[PDB]
Design a protein around this ligand. Structure first.
Ligand SMILES: *[C@@H]1O[C@H](CO)[C@@H](O[C@@H]2O[C@H](CO)[C@@H](O[C@@H]3O[C@H](CO)[C@@H](O)[C@H](O[C@H]4O[C@H](CO)[C@@H](O)[C@H](O)[C@@H]4O)[C@@H]3O)[C@H](O)[C@H]2NC(C)=O)[C@H](O)[C@H]1NC(C)=O
Ligand SMILES: *[C@@H]1O[C@H](CO)[C@@H](O[C@@H]2O[C@H](CO)[C@@H](O[C@@H]3O[C@H](CO)[C@@H](O)[C@H](O[C@H]4O[C@H](CO)[C@@H](O)[C@H](O)[C@@H]4O)[C@@H]3O)[C@H](O)[C@H]2NC(C)=O)[C@H](O)[C@H]1NC(C)=O
Ligand SMILES: *[C@@H]1O[C@H](CO)[C@@H](O[C@@H]2O[C@H](CO)[C@@H](O[C@@H]3O[C@H](CO)[C@@H](O)[C@H](O[C@H]4O[C@H](CO)[C@@H](O)[C@H](O)[C@@H]4O)[C@@H]3O)[C@H](O)[C@H]2NC(C)=O)[C@H](O)[C@H]1NC(C)=O
Lengths: 622, 623, 622
């Protein structure tokens, strides 16, 4: 049941372009959803009849006159419109919520029994589509995406919850790989965004929106390159104690490093290290929050026949101005007796939007990091895995294996000293220092958090001398530095990052970057080394290559003839980077024939392959 | 009467943005007319009451519930809308047909007694205007033009060709000058202005104009054609602003007569004027295929509860399948199956021709070198005859009394390329792909030797998608309609770009009235029309005087010939130098000794040898 | 009152079905001329009356669906207008409607009574109209009042076009930043605002642009300053920080000229002249009027079975054409008897628009002027003020002071030989001579005045052969040279004028220009001169400067020590333009200390200051 009733309010357009004094007065409106939905705040009550009752399909309002006659109608005859039809969804007493089309103004009206009152407001709605694909209607088809939308004194509206919206998915580009080449034959019914970046050091990121039919070649710098195409998923294409051991493993996810542990008298050791995962975790000093502010304008304090010298009332984005000789004796809006001895004090400030919480950003300094690594090492018959911070000190407390990953070979970061985080998205942005705010620009208003912890704003509010027909406090103001930065935020770092880094946000991090080499010291338990205790003596090895392909995954095929005393298990490895073997161990029999697969990227290569203790040389054309 | 009833169908937007399961479900829509009209295919029946009867103003539909209650209403309360009003025209049982405005989506709804159901579809309509003049409404005024439009298996409103009213633009105030044409233009709306030179190199030039501008164009001496907004195509030039076998060479240029003198020993010179009345350049046409807007058919997916479904190449149209595993769960979630990760759906779909492929298609066509006929009109003495003749050193124009053979043209030239497309009446030089070598979304995406679907082979980059498990719905992307795409990007027709002022024509593919090079011609004139020195008046002592003259006019020349003749007769007057030509070829010689003749030139101080009967002289003047 | 005429039926081209019909509510004309976004519609149906011509505030009447002359009636309740959206009427005037409509592609008037729906629609194009220099889609509740014209709401029977006041919005005051010969203009507008500028010097290099959202806009400041209008704000400008006597005063409003009258034996005289106001009044020969013409098309005179050789009927913009073989028999063409022996004469002409009077322009030659001046001269204890024409002759008949202002130093005018005046606005425009009209260009139609004093038009009307299904006379025509010039009139002279002139219009004039110097001869009444009759000798003056600021209003501060015999009153003045004194007289005491304020625009200046008879030199750094 209700404790308050529908009121009447001054409107500027009422079925006749002339300003009136009707119910259904529009006070505010919210256009913040990713969804194409709207929240309207009117002066009329819905859901109630004559009293504050429970009529699912009834509203009530003030009278055409002013007799305090709160007559009622059926929620059936209340319709919204902007520049076309509008279909409501929910009624919340004083509030409406609908999906409307263009967005030049908003008109709420009653079309009951011939009597037609309608207030309309001069607010501008814009076409909203969330995806990287332009749509005018959520597809029956397509993907589910993170978005926010409206549900279906203070807190009484339809709150802004995050949820899922259906974006369409674009018509997979017919791709054509070539010599360091990718033409991308594209054919979209609609406007799709096409992003790219190299996975090398210099990514030369490249965004564009495409429509209809074109082709789009891109170089492939040998390091490959990622391309997102219209809220598809981001495919990327390429160009086709114990013994302490010190190596240097290149920092590149998923690519195993084969090496040979050489110890006197002992038999060479199976060693493959795979940097399963890298993270670059930098230290984050959150500076402030920021969002769409709201401007509050309290009824002006007017003093009939005196001076009103306004006083600095320290808070939010406060501003006053003292205006003299305001209203003349008779009406002009008020009941003041003197003419040129009047004064009004215009005061107004800013707060956070009712929805600041659901859509804000995070000013954040970022100083140099640390980097963990998911190392997976295999030695002989056992494979183990430890995480390790990359500095000359902290050992990866793997129980059976003590590893320390030396200082990375080149300090590199995707981030700048200063960073903004919007949603899951981080941008390198030189946001102003807390308290050094410029208006209409990003960070126009600031706050250490959402709980309005000392919010300091600068929104260039400008109070205007009010004319004398009504008590209305006028003012201009700057634009919303947030919204303005939003419509002009770049393509995220997750899409521009200089090394194929996969920027992640809660911990700010650069997942799976690829650059430089990592020194690594491994303490292998003596308990897994075999000392010349392979009964087979091995002698007279030679190398023959059966087949070969140039620059493939594993197109190499070579065989090794020899003579061994008995049976055992040899570790095979190449002592020249011009080639690498697919396997690191081989079951040597007495037959004297060992087939091994390898990979290269040359026409006529020369590499020294090594069985157990012996070494040879191989050759072939690819 | 009807044998089938209104059904219910899943929609994606129903008065509340939420997808529903309502009647009035929109299944397809057609946006192909040149007219601004639309064909809609709904789930509800119109024209019938409770049963399949004859209610001119009644429809029926399924219920709000599902009781198979087929309740009825009045065709009065069914309204269409897209982004504004829409006015229907006809009801065809399941079908609607209206004219609608913008074209972002389509919404069919019932606004009866407070209960409001409405399905709406995410289709995009575009502003259609047929003419070369932009209009938003057919004028009360203006021209009638060829267009296609909807009438008012096969049950819809068919697509017939007919006539549409385009507006005609405000005649440009033209100003001729020295090799010059400024075109002062002033249009209320968007009009297309085309041009091309009539010479060898036409440098064609299209532009759409609005409001007020000027547009000069050179005039290369060969003149030039300009169409201006579905006006008719005026063009402007640069003047001020057996028997005896005779061998000449007539320039190939329509309507311009060739005066010559037959000189035979002892015989009296002969009246000879040849007018190439008409030329045609008829090249051999190998139609390759048809092409048009395809339609994609998606048959209900065959799902096998708890097994593998390895799909098989079912050879036809543009067929494609894909086998999707671990599709749906148990009971409700996905089609009444019982296993979870032991499921499989086969997504299959193909393409056909549009219901309207026939009314709007194109014709892939190779064009190898031609033959050219000519409408020759020859006059000799008192008789004028006319024969058609192929232009090769052989085939004689079987005119009964006159045997003509037109030698091989002086320069093989064609307006066409080895490969050509013909859309409506319009031909474009376009390198369409070979039959069976189709690229998708590009022209010729789908092919067919004819409209009777004679082995249609398509490539439309269809891509099947793994269906999610809340409904049995087979998803897929696809390429764009290579036809429509080529349509929105067909150039300006050849009829408007042709390099010699050719008037490209289509049913026989032909280049009417081109103008280039000279035509050798051998004429066998019947001896029976030659006069041998049998003009009694002896003619002697001719001289030439020019009274007036204008330079480069139609016939501004005026000269007189004094002489002395024995008696009366009829002389043939002709000029033995191309620097000038006479308007008349015969003259009634009297004894007076004074003959006035009109001539035309294009020089200041010309020198030409005029010839009466047998005598010859020289004339002079400044123009 | 009551009516004497009834609703008729007319051929329409679109009637609820795209097919042309023969319905009531036939739209005959429409008016789209207001600055307001309002429309005047002329239909075939009568409003305000029932069955007879009575007084039904809410009733209309019309012809029948059939043709029985049955003039049935409805309620003015069910008649609605639309163009491409809703339309709300305002007034009913018998045959006329008047509404505010949105886009403007066509116009549709219809009746939606009891299921029977007739609607005629017309192919006219309405355009978005906003009057201000600020783009708006709705008059603000806020903002300024501006001159505009609009249709009333209370031959001659329509809703007339009266000039009045329209509310334009006022833009968000630019945050301005002054610098070294510099003005950056930080701008932030919700909407499209016009930003004009011009230098106040000789060469103004005027610069218009429309801005939106947020930018910055620097402008040089040429030492002469410069005016900037910003979006129907007011146009701020910023700068760079008896005895006959013959002087030459610089022509510059409000800046006083201090001088010393030196006469033998007499004591120097207080002389300050302020050119309070200047006017440049040139001679105006109005040539013609011009405006939106209207084309009249009288029913064609057709002669059944004969030739109709049309005759030059001398008037307005007359044109005829004789068309032969028009209509076959009856319903072969227009009811007649012969087929190819028919002839129609198509005639049509132009008039002035019903509203030509409220919105026209004025072709006007302008030959060289005269210039008056508001001179305010002060001599000793008395200050007087005379106006004076600036030529070597006419004396300013001030009673006690005879002044003659010599011929100005440089003949300069803001205007060209030929000028157009639209509203209050004058543009330099080479309009064609009377009778030398080109069509669609400005001055397409002409008239010595509004009373249609011999109006001569050239509107390229082109008659077309009418097709034979109806008697309808077709024709093309050129565009409205007026309207065309309107949409393409430049920025007014009031905004481009080369010397900071304030162009004014009724008398055509150039208010308060600033250029060159004015010679002036003054006849000062001997009766105000003091001859060495001040009791003090003055001797030994020196100059000391206390403080100084460079290029300020009056930042200079100097003191003068000396020795005087007695008390008196000295005239202080600077004998070098490098500096000027704020005061011209000083009360000399015996103390020997005189403090004076001065102004300069230099770092280390050198000027010769002069007391009574003595002279010195001053110095300081600023
Ligand atoms: C983007 O890169 C793509 C992928 O390479 C590229 O596609 C290919 O371009 C080449 C350039 O012609 C084409 O190769 C041709 O094969 C066709 C027949 O299909 C021919 O017409 C060509 O012959 C010419 O080119 C030869 C090599 O220069 C010459 O030696 C010869 O004399 C001819 O001039 C040629 O062999 C290939 O067809 C395309 N593939 C397609 C259809 O995309 C594409 O060109 C690049 N696109 C852009 C916009 O950069
Ligand atoms: C294209 O279309 C037309 C066709 O020519 C053309 O119209 C006229 O062209 C000429 C040249 O542009 C213009 O003639 C001029 O008229 C003025 C003013 O009345 C003259 O006195 C001009 O100057 C003469 O003397 C001057 C100094 O000696 C020289 O400037 C000049 O060489 C002359 O000797 C001059 O003769 C005429 O203005 C237009 N008239 C129109 C527009 O109807 C038009 O200008 C061409 N425009 C384009 C877009 O090419
Ligand atoms: C329009 O003109 C305005 C007014 O000149 C101009 O204003 C800009 O103001 C900003 C903010 O002050 C200037 O940005 C910098 O501000 C700092 C400290 O606040 C300066 O001292 C900067 O220069 C430093 O760095 C430069 C490289 O080391 C050196 O040039 C300098 O010696 C300093 O080390 C700098 O001024 C900005 O420079 C001015 N702009 C100037 C002066 O041109 C505004 O930029 C102008 N806008 C446009 C669009 O032209």
């Amino acid at each position: 049941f209700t404790l308050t009733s529908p009121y009447l309010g001054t409107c500027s357009y009422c079925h006749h372009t002339v300003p009136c004094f009707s119910p259904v007065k529009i006070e505010q409106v919210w256009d913040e959803a990713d969804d194409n939905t709207i929240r309207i705040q009117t002066s009329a009550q819905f859901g109630y009849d004559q009293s504050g009752a429970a009529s699912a399909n009834k509203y009530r309002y003030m009278s055409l006159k002013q007799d305090h006659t709160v007559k009622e109608g059926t929620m059936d005859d209340i319709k919204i419109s902007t520049s076309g039809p509008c279909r409501r969804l929910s009624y919340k007493g004083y509030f409406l919520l609908a999906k409307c089309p263009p967005g030049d103004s908003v008109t709420v009206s009653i079309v009951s029994s011939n009597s037609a009152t309608s207030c309309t407001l001069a607010r501008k709605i814009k076409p909203k589509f969330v995806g990287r694909e332009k749509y005018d209607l959520p597809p029956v088809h397509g993907k589910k995406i993170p978005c926010t939308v409206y549900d279906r004194k203070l807190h009484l509206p339809f709150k802004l919850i995050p949820s899922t919206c259906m974006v369409p998915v674009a018509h997979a580009p017919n791709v054509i790989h070539g010599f360091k080449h990718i033409s991308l034959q594209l054919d979209t019914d609609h406007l799709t965004l096409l992003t790219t970046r190299r996975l090398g050091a210099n990514p030369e990121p490249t965004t564009e929106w495409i429509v209809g039919k074109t082709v789009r070649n891109f170089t492939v710098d040998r390091d490959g390159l990622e391309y997102i195409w219209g809220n598809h998923e981001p495919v990327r294409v390429y160009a086709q104690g114990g013994y302490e051991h010190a190596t240097t493993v290149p920092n590149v996810p998923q690519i195993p490093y084969k090496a040979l542990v050489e110890r006197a008298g002992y038999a060479p050791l199976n060693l493959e290290i795979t940097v399963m995962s890298s993270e670059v975790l930098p230290s984050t000093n959150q500076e402030y929050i920021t969002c769409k502010f709201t401007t509050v304008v309290p009824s002006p304090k007017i003093k009939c026949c005196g001076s009103l010298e306004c006083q600095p009332a320290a808070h939010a984005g406060y501003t006053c101005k003292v205006f003299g000789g305001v209203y003349p004796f008779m009406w002009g809006g008020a009941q003041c007796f003197c003419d040129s001895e009047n004064s009004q004090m215009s005061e107004a400030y800013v707060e956070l939007s009712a929805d600041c919480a659901s859509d804000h950003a995070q000013a954040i300094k970022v100083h140099t990091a640390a980097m963990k690594v998911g190392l997976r090492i295999v030695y002989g018959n056992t494979t183990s895995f430890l995480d390790v911070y990359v500095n000359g000190v902290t050992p990866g407390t793997s129980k059976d294996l003590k590893v320390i990953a030396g200082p990375i070979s080149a300090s590199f970061t995707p981030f700048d000293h200063k960073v903004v985080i919007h949603r899951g998205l981080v941008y390198n942005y030189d946001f102003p220092e807390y308290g050094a705010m410029k208006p209409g620009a990003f960070g126009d208003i600031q706050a250490t958090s959402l709980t309005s912890k000392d919010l300091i704003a600068s929104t260039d509010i400008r109070l205007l001398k009010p004319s004398a027909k009504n008590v209305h406090v006028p003012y201009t103001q700057a634009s919303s530095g947030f919204e303005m930065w939003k419509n002009n935020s770049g393509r995220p770092l997750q899409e521009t990052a200089p090394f194929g880094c996969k920027i992640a946000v809660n911990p700010l991090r650069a997942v799976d970057c690829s650059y430089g080499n990592i020194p690594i010291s491994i303490d292998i338990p003596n308990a897994a080394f075999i000392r010349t205790s392979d009964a087979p003596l091995v002698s007279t090895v030679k190398c023959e290559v059966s087949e070969c392909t140039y620059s493939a995954d594993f197109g190499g095929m070579a065989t090794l003839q020899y003579v061994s005393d008995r049976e055992g298990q040899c570790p095979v490895h190449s002592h020249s980077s011009t080639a690498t073997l697919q396997e690191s161990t081989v079951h040597v029999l007495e037959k004297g024939a060992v087939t091994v697969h390898f990979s290269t990227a040359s026409p006529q290569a020369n590499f020294i392959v090594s069985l157990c203790g012996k070494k040879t040389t191989c050759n072939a054309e690819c």
